[PDB]
Paper text:
The main structural motif is an eight stranded mixed β-sheet located in the centre of the monomer. On the one side of this sheet there are two long helixes, while on the opposite side there are five helixes with additional three stranded parallel β-sheets and a complicated network of loops.
Analysis of the Matthews volume for the native [name] crystal indicates the presence of one molecule in the asymmetric unit (VM = 2.37 Da·Å−3 solvent content 48.14%). The last one had the best statistics in the Phaser program and this solution was used for further structure refinement. In the presented crystal structures the monomer is an asymmetric unit. The structures of the apo [name] and its complex with RB are very similar; the rmsd of the superposed monomers is 0.571 Å.
Author numbering:
A (entry chain A), B (entry chain A), C (entry chain A): 11 to 297
The structure:
Amino acid sequence: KNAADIAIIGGSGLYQMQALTNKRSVKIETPYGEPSDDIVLGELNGVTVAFLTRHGQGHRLTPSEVPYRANIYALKTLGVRYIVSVSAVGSLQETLKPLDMVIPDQMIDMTKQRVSTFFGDGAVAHVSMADPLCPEVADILIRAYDNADIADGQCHAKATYVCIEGPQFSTRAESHWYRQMQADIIGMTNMPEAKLAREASIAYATLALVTDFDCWHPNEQAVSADYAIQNLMKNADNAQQVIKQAVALIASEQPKSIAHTALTQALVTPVEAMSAETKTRLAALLP
Amino acid sequence: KNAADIAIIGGSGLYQMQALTNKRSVKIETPYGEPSDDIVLGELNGVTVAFLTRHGQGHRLTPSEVPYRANIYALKTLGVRYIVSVSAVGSLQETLKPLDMVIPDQMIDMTKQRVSTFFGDGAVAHVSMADPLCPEVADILIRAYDNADIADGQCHAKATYVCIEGPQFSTRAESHWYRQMQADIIGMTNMPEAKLAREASIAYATLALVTDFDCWHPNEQAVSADYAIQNLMKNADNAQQVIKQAVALIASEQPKSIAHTALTQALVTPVEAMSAETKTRLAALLP
Amino acid sequence: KNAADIAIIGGSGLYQMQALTNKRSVKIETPYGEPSDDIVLGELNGVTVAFLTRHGQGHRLTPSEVPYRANIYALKTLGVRYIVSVSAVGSLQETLKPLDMVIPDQMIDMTKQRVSTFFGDGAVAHVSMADPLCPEVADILIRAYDNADIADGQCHAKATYVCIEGPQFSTRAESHWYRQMQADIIGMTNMPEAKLAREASIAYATLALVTDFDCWHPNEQAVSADYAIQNLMKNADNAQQVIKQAVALIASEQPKSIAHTALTQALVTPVEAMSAETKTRLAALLP
């Protein structure tokens, strides 16, 4: 079988680097439909990594419609134990600047219309999201960033990510409100991704790429002709360097994650009480 | 007809007590589908009480999928005028400890994906939820708790219950955020139950059983082998004693509730303007 | 073709004034279904205005079920460039009194179950809602209010509108929470209306009519026999005077709105990459 211990979720061409060898595609069907796009597999110095383009090829999906359950289920069928999610974010804080990266340790789920569990319809489980982003993988990302020797910006850790429904950007009042809730960065995609990955017993952490001040800072800038091209471009290229470094550390270090046994004390419906349809739907998630 | 003035909504075997006589089951169909499980009826010292197992037998439903509308409609068809809802909650406050009970007077609805009204599709009404939990029934619960002489814990009143979608437990950031909104306890089930009960003109109040500190307090405890069994067990048994006391007080005192006429000044669409399908669907709710 | 530069969204009989000539109705079909009701067109001193009864005739729709997408799409097909949305609101602030009007400059979207974009299913766009209510149209509304010489109340500007799902009114705890988020007024209808209007490149602003203190102020008053009739009546009649004044100013002044080109730098999927079904669905929104 095609198999990977590690996966990256982000934009396409995160995988488009000569360092990534024997680039190949796999179509995985799941009980939840198809993932956003064929998962790309290849090796980074002999280590197999799965890359999943969250928004599909050509960026064809809005955050609200991303098939999060199919995406996470498909990664679980490849045997993925670690996920690095890479995403563009607005800053809510003066010291978090465009081209900086942020490794949050906390999250607040403000999304509204997304299916955010694998459970229901015949099975009940309540995983803990107290620490929603694996601190072992977040600590690796910090060292990976340093190892990547990135030229512009700095990397910040121990930050709070607020996830909103989208697809519109926030009003100034909502931005002010997120600041008062002590959030630091804002995106649209890492919820319910983090909740599902937890249910799937996969360690999950985020590498956030600051792309502008959310509107708490009136600018209408870093969204220009000579800018958001270079901005997004540079973030994307820098992000690729960090991921290369992170893969090598995850491969050699293999940190134990609390996510790895998240299901075992959370499951309320014993497997022997599930219907056949339920057990089948949940098969890759179960022990 | 089978009839009850009072109903309890909670776990099964709230009704499993020798004091409850001529235990019987009734299957009630509603315009909203079936309730979570057959309603159990019996007498507590001659007084008939309906018990409804919110999560179904064997705890088979997640909070998000509980058929709240069918549950409340079915209780209304039995002529229920008072509901005591019993539910497990996390504490957001140092002085609210595991095995304590809490009688909240306020609620904040943070649920996302639940149908939370009987209205729409041919009828418009806007009930007031200013006081979402009947203070007459909440005052009875306080005296009932004292009357029950419970051995462990204490009971706290005038608290705020935040209801979240689930099924996962909160991140630490969300727990911090609920604390800043001045919530005291967190659960997943009493919304939209309280809104529907109000629309149904039934007095409704909550008895909350503290089962752990929500993650604002890092522990990984009171969820152990020698613990969450005894914890949940003891809460359940203590809860049964309080309910016995509450039923006797509600029966002898019959307090007037503002919930009893909540529909009459809230209804925008006069009954004579409703279609036949609408009037039929809403029949048990109307005057 | 039937055509209007300006539209009013509110209660019926906003248009029921002798000043409004050659009153006529148009049934507009959209890719989203039908609008809440036939749009009424007529002239205010030679200027053609579209009036759309948000809740349908006889107030038959709850806020949650209003067909916001069909409503905004239909107005866009009439060539509307400016929308004044008129809505009843609860006050969260002592200085905002019943019969006052409020022209908010900010909004916080707390609605849960409303489709709040035209995008998805084949097209991706992210408009900025930083300033969600056109300040040119809001400045006109302030001068229009003064010009209308309204007898009771005053008009307040630069306020924050929190939009909730409904249909029930807020608990006291939620009202306290909105106050702490610095919201000033509460309604149920201007989201997703404002987001859709932005996507549609139409300038949009709200005239809010204070109809009572939200429950942060315990009263059970201005909802009485000799009151909420006169209250709502007077608000409605005063609102009509302001709208007359606003139309004349919008017609002579024709302010440029940032909403007018909101789509052009927000669209991620180029038109040439859309399917035929997508381009067709979105036709009136595109360049």
